Swiss-Prot record, chain A:
Residues annotated as binding L-arginine: 168, 277-278, 282, 287
Effect on the protein upon substituting residue 395 to C: Found in a colorectal cancer sample; somatic mutation
Function field: Produces nitric oxide (NO) which is implicated in vascular smooth muscle relaxation through a cGMP-mediated signal transduction pathway. NO mediates vascular endothelial growth factor (VEGF)-induced angiogenesis in coronary vessels and promotes blood clotting through the activation of platelets.
Subunit structure: Homodimer. Interacts with NOSIP and NOSTRIN. Interacts with HSP90AB1. Forms a complex with ASL, ASS1 and SLC7A1; the complex regulates cell-autonomous L-arginine synthesis and citrulline recycling while channeling extracellular L-arginine to nitric oxide synthesis pathway.
Tissue expression: Platelets, placenta, liver and kidney.
Residue numbers binding heme b: 105, 396
Record region (Interaction with NOSIP): 31-401
Family recorded in the similarity comment: Belongs to the NOS family.
Designated name of the protein: Nitric oxide synthase 3
Localisation per UniProt entry: Cell membrane; Membrane, Caveola; Cytoplasm, Cytoskeleton; Golgi apparatus
Organism lineage string: Eukaryota, Metazoa, Chordata, Craniata, Vertebrata
Binding-site residues, Zn(2+): 27, 32
Binding site for (6R)-L-erythro-5,6,7,8-tetrahydrobiopterin: 35, 286, 367-368, 381
Highest taxon, organism lineage: Eukaryota
From Swiss-Prot, chain B:
Region of interest (Interaction with NOSIP), ranges: 32-401
Species for this entry: Homo sapiens (Human)
Quaternary organization: Homodimer. Interacts with NOSIP and NOSTRIN. Interacts with HSP90AB1. Forms a complex with ASL, ASS1 and SLC7A1; the complex regulates cell-autonomous L-arginine synthesis and citrulline recycling while channeling extracellular L-arginine to nitric oxide synthesis pathway.
Entry's localization field: Cell membrane; Membrane, Caveola; Cytoplasm, Cytoskeleton; Golgi apparatus
Tissue: Platelets, placenta, liver and kidney.
Designated gene of the protein: NOS3
Binding residue positions for heme b: 105, 396
Membrane-crossing residue ranges in chain numbering: none
UniProt-recorded name of the protein: Nitric oxide synthase 3
Residues at which Zn(2+) binds: 28, 33
Length: 401, 401
């Protein structure tokens, strides 16, 4: 079992949980590919059997009558139908486990506190839309954000998938420009074009909230505008740089990923949007300062009267820190939940400790857990980590177009 | 079987075909990635054959008279002696290759410019000291630093190694207390205790340059005072924070790693100190702000009158940036070569581009290439990378005790 050191404290642990890693990653003894962003009834049964074992362990009923009976029921259902259905309590447990198992999530100290909306009876894209609106409403909670997932019907033989075409429930449009530039968010050019192609009348601002493209089984995607009073946004200002407000920057309250596949015990839920709350570096560092995103770093630095003619003035570092200060201040001012990267990584360290006691390890992707500014100022930088895949899991999947 | 590698800032794609040549298996498997872990008779002929072939291809002389002749001589030497001697030009070529192959080095744009001092006729620790003193004076060059390596005799069976017990040629002492805590550098408490144990009168300061412990084969180490005029140091001041000087901080000019093992063509050099120049985050972020190093961050924030009562003021990030400014300002004022993390990573992207054309890829350790502050503000953050072991190489080796 891999030995793991924390270099700040000197403590050492062994990740025994990694030995149970079912599915395989991209690395080999010849080469490590850890930095890459994107690396049959019998096999359904063995996946299902392992999940049921997980579930009955969690409720202190391993080896019990109810445990063996459920294993038998699942085998019989797979034999008779090619698939099986989760019980409601199994779905809740499995959704929480998938979050808990997500190696790239620094917010997992919260994994036990997750509101699970069971939408597996959803019949249409129109009912899908209503479920999504109520997710957004519940999760936003007027700024006091609450973690939630809504689970739409599973993939099954004989029917297409439910899919949310949007990568998040709330996203800003990206309009390819006349001269080849992008107005708004360059990350969203593709989905923006698809929305227009599907009847949306575009805007022309930098922060136009996109409509939803929702796909019911064997249906074209259908366009739905979000009710604007459901989409809580935060205008960005800085506590001491009064000109910052004149940038006209905004971001939205709710980070709700909507393009990932939820896998539980072999069953696949291609539509299962989940939401928490932001860590401020996601907005202030990546979304606003990535060169291929809003790319505001140099404009802020010039307004700050920094010397942008030389790298050794650290103008980039200074401007990025104040942009992150603006995000934290603005969300706090607006009474919208947000966590800074110091508080988040501190809580993740407690999560690793909890998980070492509970499970003998914790799958974690160092390059995603360490924040994109001030890396070695946070405790996770000095913590060696073991990255591996456990199920239940959130998985990437191809775009439906 | 050729990993696809994407740069996410630009969208460009390359394939690392060089990875298909990796010799020493790394620590990762398809079941788990260990990429964040700091530390994971005549097969000598196959390693020598391969290295000789490397040398002659690099001079456009594969399959020619001198190539075959050199192949026979190493064969004859190993048959008659069980080992072989590197030609002078081969030692130079191999040192530069080991540097070029170092996956954790962001400074490899310089790999072609390296001064190699051949100390393979060395004997006794007194000779090492004069060799080390020659290196330090050459490398330091009154602040206009020049990359250099000194290669002491290779390991041979039945006889002890040449070893430098210090991890660097210049290191500050770390002294315990009437209460456990350390005055000076906590990274060097052990070698301080070893140096004192061998007769060195310790100082009482936070920045006392340690003596050298130099080990001739099968002899105990010998203490050597470094000539103080040969140890160039930089008092740290800040361009605008007038009180920063009064903190009494210093760092040394020359980063000279002296505990790693150089391996060329199957031959091993446990004493081969190499030096370049600092990247400013090494000093300003890790050495001065790591909690287990000088841990100065909060003292600087107090002096800056920052709100240390909440993490979301980003007082840590602000104090860190100003410490890095102070490092850069002070080295530039002292006319000592230094490179900031923005300049260094941009040069590394150019190195990756050069290596793509020259060799079809480049072994790179993402977690070590991305700087410890402002990670996603540097281009390497957005570059996918492949990590693997090529030879010649710098390897880690156990403490010689
Ligand atoms: C409660 C507050 C939460 C915080 C502060 C948080 C934080 C984060 C952050 C910073 C990332 C990296 C995202 C990026 O760089 O793009 C992430 C990834 C992720 N989070 Fe969490 N998260 C939270 C809640 C949740 C919840 C409720 C779930 C699921 C039930 C979840 C599942 C995931 C997954 C699957 C990823 C990986 C996404 C990917 O790699 O594409 N997170 N989280
Ligand atoms: C010339 C300017 C140079 C710069 C700016 C530079 C920069 C760096 C940096 C920042 C690191 C990370 C080390 C740490 O985090 O403590 C590193 C590692 C390393 N450097 Fe360079 N370096 C330079 C020259 C050299 C030379 C001349 C050699 C060898 C001949 C070399 C070989 C290495 C090796 C082997 C490592 C890996 C250390 C390890 O794996 O622990 N570097 N370099
Ligand atoms: C629940 C939750 C909370 C939170 N704080 N963040 C996220 C979150 C996750 C991602 C993953 N994306 C796919 C990619 F790899 F492209 C990047 C992207 C974002 F923008 C996010 F906000 C999700
Ligand atoms: C030639 C050169 C230039 C430069 N800029 N840095 C280094 C350098 C390398 C290391 C590696 N060490 C192993 C560990 F992980 F323990 C840390 C440590 C340092 F302190 C350094 F300064 C070397
Ligand atoms: C190429 C590299 O893996 C990529 O830029 C990663 C690095 N770490 C990350 N970490 C987080 N949290 N989010 C990201 O999108 C990324 N991107
Ligand atoms: C645990 C983690 O691997 C460790 O802290 C690493 C991370 N990246 C690093 N990167 C560099 N350049 N130097 C280091 O010492 C480290 N330390
Ligand atoms: Cl986002
Ligand atoms: Cl150092
Ligand atoms: Gd003002
Ligand atoms: Gd303007
Ligand atoms: Gd005062
Ligand atoms: Zn790996």
């Amino acid at each position: 079992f891999p030995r793991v050191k924390n270099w700040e404290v000197g403590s050492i642990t062994y990740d025994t949980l990694s030995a149970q890693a079912q599915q395989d990653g991209p690395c080999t003894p010849r080469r490590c590919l850890g930095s890459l962003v994107f690396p049959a009834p019998e096999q359904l049964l063995s996946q299902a059997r392992d999940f049921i074992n997980q579930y009955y362990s969690s409720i202190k009923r391993s080896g019990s009558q109810a445990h063996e009976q459920r294993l038998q029921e699942v085998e019989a259902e797979v034999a008779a139908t090619g698939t099986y259905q989760l019980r409601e309590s199994e779905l809740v447990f499995g959704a929480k486990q998938a979050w808990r198992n997500a190696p790239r999530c620094v917010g997992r100290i919260q994994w036990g506190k997750l509101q699970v909306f069971d939408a597996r009876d959803c019949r249409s894209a129109q009912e899908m839309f209503t479920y999504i609106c109520n997710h957004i409403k519940y999760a936003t909670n007027r700024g006091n954000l609450r973690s939630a997932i809504t689970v739409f019907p599973q993939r099954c033989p004989g029917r297409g998938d439910f899919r949310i075409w949007n990568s998040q429930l709330v996203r800003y449009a990206g309009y390819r420009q006349q001269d080849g530039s992008v107005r708004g968010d360059p990350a969203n050019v593709e989905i923006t074009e698809l929305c227009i192609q599907h009847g949306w009348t575009p805007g022309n601002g930098r922060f136009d909230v996109l409509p939803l493209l929702l796909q019911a089984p064997d249906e074209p995607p259908e366009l739905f505008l979000l009710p604007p009073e459901l989409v809580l946004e935060v205008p960005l200002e800085h506590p001491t740089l009064e000109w910052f407000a004149a940038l006209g920057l905004r971001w939205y309250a709710l980070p709700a990923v909507s393009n990932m596949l939820l896998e539980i015990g072999g069953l696949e839920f291609p539509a299962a949007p989940f939401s928490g709350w932001y860590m401020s570096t996601e907005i202030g560092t990546r979304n606003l300062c990535d060169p291929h995103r809003y790319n505001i770093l140099e404009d802020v630095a010039v307004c700050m009267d920094l010397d942008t003619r030389t790298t050794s003035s650290l103008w980039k570092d200074k401007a990025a820190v104040e942009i992150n200060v603006a995000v934290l201040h603005s969300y706090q001012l607006a009474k919208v939940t947000i966590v800074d990267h110091h508080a988040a990584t501190a809580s993740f360290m407690k999560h690793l400790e909890n998980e070492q006691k509970a499970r003998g390890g914790c799958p974690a992707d160092w390059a995603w857990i360490v924040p994109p500014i001030s890396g070695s100022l946070t405790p996770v930088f000095h913590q060696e980590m073991v990255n591996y895949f456990l199920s239940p899991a959130f998985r990437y999947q191809p775009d439906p177009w």
